[PDB]
Amino acid sequence: ADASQIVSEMGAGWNLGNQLEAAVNGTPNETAWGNPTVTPELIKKVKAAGFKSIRIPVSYLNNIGSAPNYTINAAWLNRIQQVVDYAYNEGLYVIINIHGDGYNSVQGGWLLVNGGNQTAIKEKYKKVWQQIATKFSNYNDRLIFESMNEVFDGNYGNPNSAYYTNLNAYNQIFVDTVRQTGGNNNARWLLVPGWNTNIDYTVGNYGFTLPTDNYRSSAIPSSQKRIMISAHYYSPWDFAGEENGNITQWGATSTNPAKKSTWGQEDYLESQFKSMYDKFVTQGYPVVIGEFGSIDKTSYDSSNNVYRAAYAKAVTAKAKKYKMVPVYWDNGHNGQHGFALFNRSNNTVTQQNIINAIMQGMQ
Numbered sequence: 222a223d224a225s226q227i228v229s230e231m232g233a234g235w236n237l238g239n240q241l242e243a244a245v246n247g248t249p250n251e252t253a254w255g256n257p258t259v260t261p262e263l264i265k266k267v268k269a270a271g272f273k274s275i276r277i278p279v280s281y282l283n284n285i286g287s288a289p290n291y292t293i294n295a296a297w298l299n300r301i302q303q304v305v306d307y308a309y310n311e312g313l314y315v316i317i318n319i320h321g322d323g324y325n326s327v328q329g330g331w332l333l334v335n336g337g338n339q340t341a342i343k344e345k346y347k348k349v350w351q352q353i354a355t356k357f358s359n360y361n362d363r364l365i366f367e368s369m370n371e372v373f374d375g376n377y378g379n380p381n382s383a384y385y386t387n388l389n390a391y392n393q394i395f396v397d398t399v400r401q402t403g404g405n406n407n408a409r410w411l412l413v414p415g416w417n418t419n420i421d422y423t424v425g426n427y428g429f430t431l432p433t434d435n436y437r438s439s440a441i442p443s444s445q446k447r448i449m450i451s452a453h454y455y456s457p458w459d460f461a462g463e464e465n466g467n468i469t470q471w472g473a474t475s476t477n478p479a480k481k482s483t484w485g486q487e488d489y490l491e492s493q494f495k496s497m498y499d500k501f502v503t504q505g506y507p508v509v510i511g512e513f514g515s516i517d518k519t520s521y522d523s524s525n526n527v528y529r530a531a532y533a534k535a536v537t538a539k540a541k542k543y544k545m546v547p548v549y550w551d552n553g554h555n556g557q558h559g560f561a562l563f564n565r566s567n568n569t570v571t572q573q574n575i576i577n578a579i580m581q582g583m584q
């Protein structure tokens with residue numbers, strides 16, 4: 222699939238959140254954050270709801286062995302492959318990444334743009350991607366590798382240019398390392414972010430650079446890309462992610478201005494997504510909005526789900542407008558401040574109206 226066709230085929234995506242990226246005191250464990258062990262039935266339920274792509278956060282952390290081989294625990298790679306297969310064998314697009322490892326705030330986090338030993342970070346990263354790519358080399362273009370997740374130094378202000386250079390270096394190392402492994406890895410789509418998956422800091426003049434891809438398969442036309450660009454979207458945070466009841470409504474259908482943000486509405490969403498279209502999509506790079514969503518505030522405002530639905534529809538529809546892939550953030554938590562649309566304990570739907578809103582947004 223070329224850049225336009227892949228977006229169409231990917232449809233609406235869903236994150237298998239709070240599973241294989243979950244870690245406590247440095248060891249990944251897919252149950253560590255309270256979700257059950259993943260089973261194929263969950264992925265079948267998500268497919269039945271209409272999602273065509275599954276994003277699978279994966280952490281590695283202390284399952285990476287010592288230098289210089291940095292060997293990944295074999296049982297962990299085998300488990301990741303089993304979970305990938307639950308989605309891949311159902312005909313879905315699948316994205317796998319390196320997730321917790323890039324955070325300063327995660328115990329064992331090491332893929333740090335601000336870290337002092339960039340030589341060791343870069344070599345470890347190379348060796349880790351060599352192994353993950355090798356494990357999945359025979360998978361077709363429905364499997365996408367994502368270089369890393371949300372990578373920054375912890376500061377929400379303007380990016381340090383030297384640190385941005387490290388980020389860009391990681392993306393370049395990832396691309397070239399993956400291509401030089403076997404199988405279909407020289408041809409598959411590879412997803413890369415800019416700083417903290419932030420749209421403004423990725424599209425603006427802050428230091429992001431597009432990787433070269435000179436080791437890719439000769440079969441890819443010179444005029445096409447096999448790189449996609451990642452951003453995440455939870456704006457305005459006071460509505461979407463802040464864990465209190467100050468703001469519980471969003472968009473034009475809000476019924477109370479005291480419960481609605483003063484910024485970040487439909488006009489902002491338009492400007493933001495148009496900026497990704499103008500910078501990247503027009504140049505032949507698909508864009509994946511790899512996470513979006515809003516937390517459950519029905520404990521504060523009994524009308525909140527009206528707005529969670531409205532927000533999800535609006536973000537999905539804006540992605541559709543601008544020919545980019547919207548991927549919903551589902552963390553399995555049903556309850557206060559949760560993001561789940563399904564109860565993973567029984568594979569039931571818990572948020573039919575939000576699912577319907579997403580699917581309406583794909584029309």
Ligand SMILES: [Ca+2]
Nearest residue numbers: 371462512550
């Ligand atoms: Ca998060």
